[PDB]
Amino acid sequence: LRSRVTDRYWRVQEVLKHARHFRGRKNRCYRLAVRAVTRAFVKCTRARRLKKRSLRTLWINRITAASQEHGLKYPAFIINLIKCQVELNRKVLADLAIYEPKTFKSLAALAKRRREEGFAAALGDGKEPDGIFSRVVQHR
Amino acid sequence: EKDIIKMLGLEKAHTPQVHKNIPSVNAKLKVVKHLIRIKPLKLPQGLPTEEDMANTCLKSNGELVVRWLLN
Amino acid sequence: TARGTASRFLTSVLHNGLGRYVQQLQRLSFSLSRDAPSSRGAREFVEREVTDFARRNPGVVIYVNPRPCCVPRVVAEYLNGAVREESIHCKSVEEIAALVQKLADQSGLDVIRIRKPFHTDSPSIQGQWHPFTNKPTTLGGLRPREVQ
Amino acid sequence: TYSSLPDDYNCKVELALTSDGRTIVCYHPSVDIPYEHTKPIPRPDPVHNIEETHDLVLKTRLEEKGEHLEQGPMIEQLSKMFFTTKHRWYPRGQYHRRRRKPNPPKDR
Amino acid sequence: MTGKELFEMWTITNPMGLLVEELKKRKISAPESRLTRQSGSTTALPVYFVGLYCDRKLIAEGPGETVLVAEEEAARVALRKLFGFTENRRPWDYSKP
Amino acid sequence: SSFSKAPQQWATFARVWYLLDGKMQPPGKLAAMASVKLQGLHKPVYHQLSDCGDHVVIM
Amino acid sequence: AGSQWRLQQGFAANPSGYGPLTELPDWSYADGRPAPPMKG
Amino acid sequence: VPKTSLGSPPWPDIVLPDPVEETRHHAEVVGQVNELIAAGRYGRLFAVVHFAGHQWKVTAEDLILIENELDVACGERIRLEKVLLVGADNFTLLGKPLLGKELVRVEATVIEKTESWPKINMKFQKRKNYQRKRITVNPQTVLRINSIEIAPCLC
Ligand SMILES: [Mg+2]
Ligand SMILES: [Mg+2]
């Protein structure tokens, strides 16, 4: 009983469809194509993890542009926004910076204020003053 | 040290685990003390009753709060 | 892969869910064999579930054809014009039910990479940043070295 | 009468804290550009193409402009206009023109 | 009508004139085109921001490649404020009275 | 906020010319801000595949 | 960042932990009936 | 009082207003904004909302794609509860880190339940003869956010 592979055609297409848009002989020849496709998938998943880093770095660069406009460096802006209990991820913060320049100038005003309050309290050397924006609220 | 960490329940990182302060335990902890952070458990509201088991939570200052999020 | 395939922005057909929600699935056609084992699940589904399904969704027309086939299919068809083919071949009643549900709740848009998770017309309320938006204006509106 | 940032530009920004303490509110009306800070629209229109003798000749004198250059110098001039390097302006092969998508996705 | 503009569907060809008429109706007088912001005049890609002023208050403002284009824009913007067809405008109500 | 599409987009990606005086400045500290403004990294709309970058004139 | 401050103030070093940000049931039916609880 | 490059700190001196006048000023401003709300003089609102583990910048009539399943029928209206930021052309409300449910209400409809396009995931190792190829399909849910309403109560 001899058995040969009849469907080999389709076996090949499932590789070759992913190779269509390559340059050179990689987009035809099953040998070359197979290796190239595999490399393409691997590169793809690795890039799926990378993409998230890339985007977050983008957002940080944009937020830095936006802050620097208002004479406020990036770290100051971010941590002094945290110290106001305002938790907005960098995605949203960048989008505000682009599409909501007003609200962003407000946020920047807040941060700047909170920072100055911090310096004031550190130089003051007493427990009595609590800056208006340096107050820490608990959940209700 | 790998074994000591395994038998302290410390397998997963940045997860808290609670242990008696008896010498038996302190011995192992002493072996791995550079791999860990040890902070005393505090009970402001005291130990939980059986009505309070579902509402218990552990705050980072190392303190166990019995009533979490009333209404 | 993403460079490999086509892509689209996130959209609704006919701004669905804005004014009111319209179930996008239009008709559903089953083809199965009374005799063949491959269609077994699909038969059971037609017995018990189809009826109830038809009440739960008044807006979709369901055509059931017994015919001599080896591979039972369900053809979903949408308001969009979109036609989506499926094979119910050799599945449970449970599996088919879940599948028919997926078909019921889909938009009929093509399934491909979606470029970004949100879609907004007028994202920009209160302005959109441009190089001048944060710059101060001067007196007379002179340039840096300009004299008057 | 205090804000952390000057009101010169963008919005005048007011930062208030709710009496509760659990909400920050910001009032930010736009700041319009003062008249005294603007300069009058430049107005330039002059037509000298007119010949007093024949003015349908004059109207044909404005249609009298055109020229042709070689590839190289055309590109140099083009790249001086837009402050680009020369390279952008050269063509591209069959293979690259063929893979441009016929119908790119559109947002908005 | 979602996402669409006003002048996307209205198609009117002379914004300035229409503005002047509407301001006659509102008993306001003479919009004056006043150049506000500009970058590069000598460039192949200039940017102008022309403001429109009525009694030295600024009613509306717009961008363009050319000072003319921009003036026309400021007109369209002013129009859009007057008519209350705007981006910031209240989104439509879908509700069951 | 209400602009037509084309002028809006044009205003956003508009180029700008900065002037930077050089007298008695370290070429390094100069080149730092010059570099930022050349790459258009001072624009919240920045991306590496947008052409955005501005002219800088140092004197 | 800013975990140090968040710790001095007695919250979780990560905003994701145990705050009202995470704990609360982020949606509900329009009628006001509660939503099925969240797996997390 | 001499003056050297150093003896004076190189940064503007700061004066922050007295706490009392500030509390007054704040109550005054809040009063103003609150009037703006009660009068209905805000044009269109956007809101930053925490949902399904992510934050979004949301506005009426819009669309978001949630990467996991929600148990709701298609067509159900839903109140997204956690709201970080609300905003309008002339003012913005900030949460710490949340807005009271009495202050703002954003309702979204679920349009479409679906599944993600296939995502290939491939592990590979040089000359170890090890490949694995796995195709992921993620269940997805498309919400149309309907309305952001904001109630006059603020203090
Ligand atoms: Mg991950
Ligand atoms: Mg998990």
GROMACS .gro file of C-alpha atoms in nm, chain H residues 57-144:
model
   88
  720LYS     CA    1  -1.013   6.006   2.730
  721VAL     CA    2  -1.378   5.993   2.650
  722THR     CA    3  -1.644   6.225   2.504
  723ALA     CA    4  -2.007   6.186   2.396
  724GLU     CA    5  -2.081   5.991   2.075
  725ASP     CA    6  -1.748   5.811   2.074
  726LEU     CA    7  -1.610   5.460   2.062
  727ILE     CA    8  -1.379   5.244   2.270
  728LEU     CA    9  -1.256   4.892   2.218
  729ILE     CA   10  -1.218   4.690   2.535
  730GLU     CA   11  -0.982   4.400   2.504
  731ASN     CA   12  -1.176   4.154   2.716
  732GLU     CA   13  -1.527   4.017   2.761
  733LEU     CA   14  -1.798   4.200   2.957
  734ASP     CA   15  -2.117   4.031   3.070
  735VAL     CA   16  -2.386   4.247   2.921
  736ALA     CA   17  -2.632   4.205   2.639
  737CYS     CA   18  -2.562   4.403   2.324
  738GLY     CA   19  -2.751   4.729   2.358
  739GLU     CA   20  -2.730   4.759   2.737
  740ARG     CA   21  -2.655   5.098   2.886
  741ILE     CA   22  -2.391   5.110   3.151
  742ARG     CA   23  -2.270   5.371   3.396
  743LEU     CA   24  -1.891   5.388   3.391
  744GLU     CA   25  -1.824   5.463   3.755
  745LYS     CA   26  -1.463   5.552   3.816
  746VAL     CA   27  -1.408   5.900   3.673
  747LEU     CA   28  -1.074   6.070   3.715
  748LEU     CA   29  -1.116   6.385   3.513
  749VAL     CA   30  -1.409   6.589   3.383
  750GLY     CA   31  -1.356   6.880   3.153
  751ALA     CA   32  -1.516   7.149   2.946
  752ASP     CA   33  -1.392   7.444   2.746
  753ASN     CA   34  -1.384   7.681   3.044
  754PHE     CA   35  -1.323   7.455   3.345
  755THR     CA   36  -1.201   7.117   3.468
  756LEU     CA   37  -1.284   6.897   3.766
  757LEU     CA   38  -1.007   6.675   3.905
  758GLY     CA   39  -1.046   6.368   4.122
  759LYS     CA   40  -0.847   6.261   4.428
  760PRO     CA   41  -0.815   6.021   4.275
  761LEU     CA   42  -1.186   6.000   4.192
  762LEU     CA   43  -1.498   6.207   4.143
  763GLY     CA   44  -1.800   6.154   4.366
  764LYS     CA   45  -2.076   5.964   4.188
  765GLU     CA   46  -2.306   6.257   4.264
  766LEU     CA   47  -2.081   6.497   4.075
  767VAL     CA   48  -2.065   6.327   3.731
  768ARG     CA   49  -2.234   6.046   3.541
  769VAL     CA   50  -2.109   5.892   3.215
  770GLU     CA   51  -2.321   5.635   3.036
  771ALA     CA   52  -2.199   5.410   2.759
  772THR     CA   53  -2.376   5.151   2.547
  773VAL     CA   54  -2.223   4.823   2.445
  774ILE     CA   55  -2.252   4.801   2.069
  775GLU     CA   56  -2.061   4.498   1.967
  776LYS     CA   57  -1.929   4.178   2.119
  777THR     CA   58  -1.666   4.020   1.898
  778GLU     CA   59  -1.322   3.862   1.882
  779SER     CA   60  -0.980   3.998   1.795
  780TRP     CA   61  -0.808   3.923   1.462
  781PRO     CA   62  -0.558   3.633   1.489
  782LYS     CA   63  -0.229   3.728   1.659
  783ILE     CA   64   0.063   3.499   1.589
  784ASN     CA   65   0.308   3.422   1.868
  785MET     CA   66   0.625   3.235   1.777
  786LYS     CA   67   0.910   3.116   1.991
  787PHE     CA   68   1.234   3.014   1.829
  788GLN     CA   69   1.583   2.906   1.924
  789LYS     CA   70   1.895   2.884   1.704
  790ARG     CA   71   2.008   2.526   1.636
  791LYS     CA   72   1.816   2.383   1.927
  792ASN     CA   73   1.537   2.253   1.698
  793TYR     CA   74   1.275   2.443   1.893
  794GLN     CA   75   0.986   2.632   1.740
  795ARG     CA   76   0.645   2.684   1.882
  796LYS     CA   77   0.374   2.864   1.694
  797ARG     CA   78   0.054   2.963   1.867
  798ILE     CA   79  -0.238   3.165   1.734
  799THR     CA   80  -0.413   3.388   1.987
  800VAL     CA   81  -0.767   3.515   1.949
  801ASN     CA   82  -0.887   3.757   2.212
  802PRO     CA   83  -1.256   3.824   2.290
  803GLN     CA   84  -1.334   4.198   2.235
  804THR     CA   85  -1.612   4.441   2.330
  805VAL     CA   86  -1.692   4.772   2.155
  806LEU     CA   87  -1.859   5.037   2.370
  807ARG     CA   88  -2.018   5.354   2.234
   0.00000   0.00000   0.00000
